[model samples]
Target: GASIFRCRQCGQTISRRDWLLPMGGDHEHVVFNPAGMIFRVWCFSLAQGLRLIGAPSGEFSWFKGYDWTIALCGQCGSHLGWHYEGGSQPQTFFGLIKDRLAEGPA
Candidate 1:
């Protein structure tokens, strides 16, 4: 059966489609950190269902050459993810929190 992902705070649909990543939406990546600990984030690419609030900033992923901004639910003011606008490559994607979303029938 198909599933729909939505924001838990306001029941706003996040993704009507499944994750584009491998492992059936269980994909995660390890980011570099100053502390001696692993930092991993699970993300899924959504072609729709998100609204960007402000201009992209390069504070977080500057070294990686990507500017990102906070992504929110269009129906509610809930923080959902970050929209990454790549530099020098033109790659763009949304990195969202899996826990912030609730799955339901599609």
Candidate 2:
């Protein structure tokens, strides 16, 4: 069955199913930021349901070479993920918070 997911804070749907992407052989990762905060984010090729904020920053990037921008829930102002843009191997992706998103019945 095709899986559909929704925002945890809001009821807005996330456009994902065939867009999952693997990084270092894993679709989800446990990484930390420069501020000593840990995060477990699920990687995807695109998440059009998210609303992006501000300019992209490569500094202190968890993915090393990717520039990332804050991504929010389109329906609510909750922080959900990041929009990563890397010019190298993979072009673009979204690193979304697993807890911030809930999967619907398959």
The candidate that wins on TM-score is 2
Model 2 TM-score on a 0 to 1 scale: 0.89
All candidates: TM-score:
0.71, 0.89
Off by over 4 Å in 1: 22-26, 30-40, 87-90
Candidate 2 lDDT, 1-106, residue by residue in tens:
4477788788788857677888868989998887787889898887877789999999878786899999999888788989999655687888998888877764
Considering summed lDDT, which 10 consecutive residues are worst modelled in model 1?
Answer: 16-25
Candidate 2 segments exceeding 4 Å error: none
Candidate No. with top lDDT? 2
Estimate, for each residue in 11-81, the C-alpha lDDT of model 1 and write its tens digit: 88787456644322355665643465343445555535678988988874622677888888888878776
Q: What local lDDT score does residue 20 receive in model 1, on the 0 to 100 scale?
A: 43
